[PDB]
Amino acid sequence: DLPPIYCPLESAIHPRVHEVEKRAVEWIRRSGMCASEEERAWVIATHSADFFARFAPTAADEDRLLATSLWVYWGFAFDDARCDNGPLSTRPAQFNALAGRVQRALEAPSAEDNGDRFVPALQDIARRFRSFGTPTQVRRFVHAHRAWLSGVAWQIGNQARGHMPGLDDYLAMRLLSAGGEPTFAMLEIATGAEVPDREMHRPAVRALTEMAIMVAALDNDRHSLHTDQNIYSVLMHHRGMSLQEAVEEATKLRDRILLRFLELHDRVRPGAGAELSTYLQGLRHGIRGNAEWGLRPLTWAESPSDSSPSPLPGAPSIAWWWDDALL
Amino acid sequence: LPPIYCPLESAIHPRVHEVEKRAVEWIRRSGMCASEEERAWVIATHSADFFARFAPTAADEDRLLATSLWVYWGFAFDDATRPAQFNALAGRVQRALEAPSAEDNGDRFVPALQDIARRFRSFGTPTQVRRFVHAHRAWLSGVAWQIGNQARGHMPGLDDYLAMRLLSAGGEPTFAMLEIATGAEVPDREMHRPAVRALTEMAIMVAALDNDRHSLQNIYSVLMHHRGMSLQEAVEEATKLRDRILLRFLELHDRVRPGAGAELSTYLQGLRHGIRGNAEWGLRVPLTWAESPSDSSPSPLPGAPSIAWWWDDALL
């Protein structure tokens, strides 16, 4: 019993998606990233190029769309083999060092793989980003990437302990561990449109970005549907709901965040410069694209399941999203 | 044993005593410390003296205060955890730096950091705040990696050690506060130039290695364990590696400084004042300095491929 997804946002897909996907599938075979044929097939079947082509559906340079799509594949592969499943998945001490080595390899081209098959793959993606984006944009990606790995470390930490975070911590963690920071920070790299520091770091824009990430993360928890750390288990544990009531509750929260995204967007967009405007539409396309890609004649909710204009109850760390003085 | 090679400028803010007085006050009122003994230990760091060496001419005494507050905070945070819990703790503390609406939930360090962050947001631009934010996370990542190795009985090789220690010694957030103290906004096109990234890391690495010495998982253990050196052999070896890094910094700085804008220049002067100030603060907490480096090789450290890019001008 899943409600349709409320997502009155623009759905589009890059016209060169099949071409980029073909190049991606090839890179995957050359990359050394995958141990077996079965693993490669799994990685390919993510259709990560279909995915990221929905985030940057008018990217002028197919190579930029390719590079960024590769990291989406990389991310799914690294996630499935190192974060979500293998020995490190409940071994935070070992993961902290992996995260340190992997993150260092991203920042330091001279780093060596130390027998890790994921590292040369990542260093190649990074090499592509450094040839395309400005050092400022690469730093934004780099910082977003460490942010994601910090979320995963937090999550693997939780898993080791069997700790089910509360709502506030879960959203804070999941904001990072679902991969949205580094995903959305590639928008600029894909489109070529650099957002100036003064605009990019405006509290309002920081908030729209976090909100986009949060809706996408929560649509992913949906798509996933426990001991597993997800919105449904969090609400089941912390509020004693049945699965059905948690399903309904999660959809309200998520819809409420999306309405705030839409209201703040409408306030911010008119005065936005062109680079920021493009970034903002990327946030919209990504929210929609993430939902739709998870689904794939589709059906969508015409109305939000909840329309309260105030901060989400029990989630203080996101309440500043509704603070227009601060934004 | 051997005196430190550090031909860098030493200076200290003229209002250092005034700032230290206000800081001692804030530390007392911050709720950060459980006990008087703990407040005294935090105060005994002389972090205001330390950071007043990093930003000796800051125009606004309140910015030097705000930034000095965090140095006190970082020592206190570091002095007060298993890897699994630390990963969550790091996550939570970092979120409170980023989200003013985040609530302390009885964590003694979170309001204090949020007060520091509020002061930063009343002074610095949102951009300067983000820079500090990301440096803060990087430091936390390093502390998590170090905590991880300790928990496992994993003694990192020289490469992992330096990469980690670059993060864990606290130099990233420390140096990321120079702009907020001085008010000199560094434009991103300058701040993120790889050369400036490398100068920052080098300043950081040297300050970190001098901290290893001031402590008499550190460079000497790492070398003793992986190379089978005696302590005395490792000390000489460590001194050589470090001096060699500082030579690289001095060299790269002299290449970068002349073209630098006023804000970036002030920032680089901060790196230099920081390296010296760190060394000098560590000694004092009349001095003899080595006039010459113990090793003058201009080549990358063999056995440390993660920092080799510091010596690659092509990449810079």
Residue numbers in the entry:
A (entry chain A): 9 to 233, 241 to 311, 329 to 359
B (entry chain B): 10 to 89, 98 to 233, 244 to 312, 329 to 359
Give the article text.
Spiroviolene synthase (SvS) from Streptomyces violens was first described by Rabe et al. and represents a bacterial class I diterpene cyclase that we were not able to produce in sufficient quantities for crystallization due to protein instability. Terpene cyclases such as SvS form a variety of complex multicyclic compounds with potent biological activities via carbocationic, electrophilic cyclization cascades of relatively simple substrates, either by metal-ion assisted release of an allylic pyrophosphate (class I mechanism) or by protonation of an oxirane/ene-functionality (class II mechanism). We previously reported a hypothetical ancestor of SvS—SvS-A2 26—which shares 77% sequence identity with the extant enzyme.
SvS-A2 forms a homodimer in solution, which was confirmed by size exclusion chromatography, consistent with the dimer found in the asymmetric unit of the crystal unit cell. Each monomer harbors one active site which points away from the dimer interface, resulting in an overall antiparallel arrangement. One of the two modeled loops comprises a conserved RY-dimer of bacterial terpene cyclases in the C-terminal end of helix K (312PRYLSL318), which adopts a helical structure in the GGPP-docked model. In SdS, a catalytic effector motif consisting of a phosphate sensor, a linker-residue, and an effector residue was described to mediate an induced-fit conformational rearrangement upon substrate binding, positioning the backbone carbonyl of the effector residue in closer proximity to the substrate. A functionally equivalent motif (Arg182, Ser185, and Ala186, shown in light green in Figure 1) is present in SvS-A2. Since this motif exhibits a similar orientation in the unliganded crystal structure as in the substrate-docked model (local Cα root-mean-square deviation (rmsd) of 0.22 Å over five residues) as well as substrate-bound SdS (Cα rmsd 0.30 Å over five residues), an equivalent induced fit rearrangement would likely occur to a lesser extent in SvS-A2. While the active site lining is virtually conserved between SvS-A2 and SvS-WT, the majority of ancestral mutations are hydrophilic and dispersed on the surface of SvS-A2. The generated homology models differ in the conformation of the modeled capping loop K. In SvS-WT-Hom1 (as well as in SvS-A2) this sequence adopts a helical fold and points to the surface of the enzyme, appearing to prevent full closure of the active site cleft (top row). Studying enzyme kinetics with individual substrates revealed that SvS-A2 exhibits well-defined cooperativity for spiroviolene production with a Hill-coefficient of 2.1 ± 0.4, whereas it was previously shown that SvS-WT could not be saturated with GGPP.
